[model samples]
Target: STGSATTTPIDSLDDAYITPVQIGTPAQTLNLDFDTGSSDLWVFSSETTASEVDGQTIYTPSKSTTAKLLSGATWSISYGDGSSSSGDVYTDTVSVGGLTVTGQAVESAKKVSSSFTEDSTIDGLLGLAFSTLNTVSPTQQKTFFDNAKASLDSPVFTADLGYHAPGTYNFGFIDTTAYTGSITYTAVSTKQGFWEWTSTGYAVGSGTFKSTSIDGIADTGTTLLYLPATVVSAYWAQVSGAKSSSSVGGYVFPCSATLPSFTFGVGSARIVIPGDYIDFGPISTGSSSCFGGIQSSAGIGINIFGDVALKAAFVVFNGATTPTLGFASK
Candidate 1:
């Protein structure tokens, strides 16, 4: 069996992408962020603190007859950005696209951080990383992708994220029409519970490709591309008037400056991100400086190929006996 779902960017800047999900017998539909960086399908729910809940949609397990309480089960998860949530757990009928998974562990939020509470567009997060990353106590649960893998035609999923446009996440199959060129496969390391892979090298703009290995994870959940400080510096140095600013939070440059494209190698294949995509957006309203979509990984301690890089190519998460990652230009 296979399924496909549309992922819509929440805002003009494409800050976050959300997809529709159905839970319970009556099918409570909610928009959830499909995050490949973490594992734990959590949601804002009726159990959440009323004052903490803003305009976001909430899931009420009591309304679903198919929902079963998982007594003594609880979960708490935190992200690298510092936002977090904790909740009780329940087993329920969950559906994504057209694929259904009965007895799926559904975490209902009891408390949420201010960041999540303020983001009304995101109802929850659907983690697609390795099950080893699940933060549930006593017993960890498998991710939706892991549970549905057995029934899938092929144990694989693909992410086709677009820039400022709607995209798709396909399960069990690859849509040949969705991408161009042959896919370059790379070995994945799930040791860290992430879709981690190493790039052969990178090139700043039309410059030479430095044949140096760079380790990073393909994280759809993160907003920017984070690399080693040396690589980030090399890229920004090519742009005039660009500087790293503590007050601005990251590398920023004149809004009118023409940025250069970034390219990274996946095996022998190379994926290129257009220059315009690098000029993330204005740092502040009416400001002449723009924040870069690419930054140094020094603060996070781990290099990450976030949306800025993922959206530049079509990515496949192959969940075989020995998992692997595939990349292709779209």
Candidate 2:
């Protein structure tokens, strides 16, 4: 019997959700962030410089008989949020949930940028983005999802991210019991190799819903929601003690601020993100200044529906023709 793939409980890091993945013949397990923003199944490895290894679990290819190095090949990637990593390539058996893919190209990290080295929860990235975004030299690699899709009953994967709670990522099928209300579907344009879509507009704190169509990428790797500067300013102004400071590098408000919920229009479906989730966390300066999760995407060049917004609803990432995206309340 072929069962659908369902990942283990997501590591509720309050930002990105990490899934437990098994790779290699001996099945070396690691917690990986299922990122839709990029395509590279890379893990912290023995090849990684010792100084950057920190607390990450290293995947030693020498320990697995099935691991085969893809000679002369290298890979590198950087994110909009300043997170980056690079490594060499290897072919091995990789399994998620119950689906297994042999000869999957798994990149082993030899270097990582500061943001990735600092993020202790994410051991590496299991990219869900299109294979076209893969950075492996000589030949590209297919992501685990893409490789497993051919053998599945369906080609859809559903993301059920939660707020400080357990969330499940289901592959090959959508679990009816996981969502509430009817799932509203919207056509996604993946021309740029991302789950890119346009929202009708936004509403700040129960305010009027504007009709501005905003283009954004549905990125599970990014921790915060990012929009245009104008929209960002409008929302923060409504907060009692909110201010956009260049020194802080983004919008900030008092921890006691009475924030309002944020809502986005997705093909007639209103995906609401509660105010507390937008607060993110403290500024890390040992003060009461809370960082705003919804910031301007000016520097990044594109808006993103990161974990902060995706966690508010159940998402269906249909990889079939037209590649539609479905969203429903949880």
Candidate 3:
């Protein structure tokens, strides 16, 4: 069977994409960030410290007759952005779109970083990456997708993120009408528990394509497109008054600058990102300089094709016998 759900940007900046979720037997609704970068379905819940709870809707397992604590099981996770959360584990009924998982591992947050607390829109995160990245100890748990894959029409999921608009996440079957052209397929390295793939090369605006192997991961959880320093520098060089500012954190340029589009290849398939998407937004409330959506991943060790890149195309996360990724223009 296949299921579909709507995912929407949290704010004007499209900082993150969130989907409504139903947890527990009676179903407590909460808005969760659907992240392809990590594996671990965690939530803000009754177990969380009261002080850490802001305006988030917390899940109360006590209200669910199907809830059962996974004895001795605990989970701790930290992201590249430095935000973290940890707590005990519970197996309960969880549903997304129209798909259901009876004994899904739900990590209940006991402590959360300030970033999560301040972000009232996201009650927690629903990780869509491979299960190997799950942080639950004692007995590592499978992700919701892993548990539900077998019952699906096909062991796959798709992400269609939008720029300041609502997108979609489909499980089991691809929505043919959502995209244009034939999909470009590529091998995925699940060894790292990420939807990692190699990019053929890149071109800035109308410039000639450079044939280089740029390895990166498709991460919906992250906000910006991170590539090698050389590529990022080249893209920004075309924009007047662009500077790599440590003060503003990354590259920023004059708000009125004519920004150039960015194109990256995937097995001869070229996905072009529009200049307006790369303009990001003003660095500050009233600043005349805007932050760039593409930045250098030099210190990050691995490049990240985050929301900035993912939104440019319709992406497929195929969890078949041998995992693979598919990209198509929408």
Candidate 2 lDDT score relative to the true structure: 0.85
Tens digits of lDDT, candidate 1, 32-134 = 9999999999999999999999999999999999999999999999899999999999999999889999999999999999999999999999999999999
Question: 1-330 in candidate 3: lDDT tens per residue?
Answer: 777889999999889989998999899988999888999999999999999999999999999999999999999999999999999999999899999989999999999999999999999999999888999998999998999999999999999999889999999999999999989999999878899999999999999999999999999999999999999999999998899999988999999888889999999999999998887778888889899999999898899999999999999999999999999998
> In candidate 3, what residue range of length 10 has the lowest lDDT sum?
276-285
Off by over 4 Å in 2: 1-13
| Model 3 residue pairs with clashes | 1-153
Candidate 2 lDDT, 1-330, residue by residue in tens: 122433332343376677888888798988898898999999999899888977887789998889999999999988776678888999998888877888899999999998777767778999998888999998888888788777877888888877877678888887899888989988788889999999889999889898899999988888789999999999998898899889989999998897899999888779899988887667885789988988999988899999888989999999886698899998
TM-score of 2: 0.95
- Give the 10-residue window scoring lowest on summed lDDT in candidate 2: 1-10
In Å, residue 31's CA in model 3 sits off its true spot by: 0.8
Candidates in order have lDDT scores of 0.94, 0.85, 0.94
* Collision count for each candidate, in order: 0, 0, 1
**Candidate 1 wrong stretches, greater than 4 Å:** none
Q: Which stretches of candidate 3 lie over 4 Å from their true place?
A: none
- Model 3 vs. true fold: TM: 0.99
Error of 1 at 4 (Å): 0.2
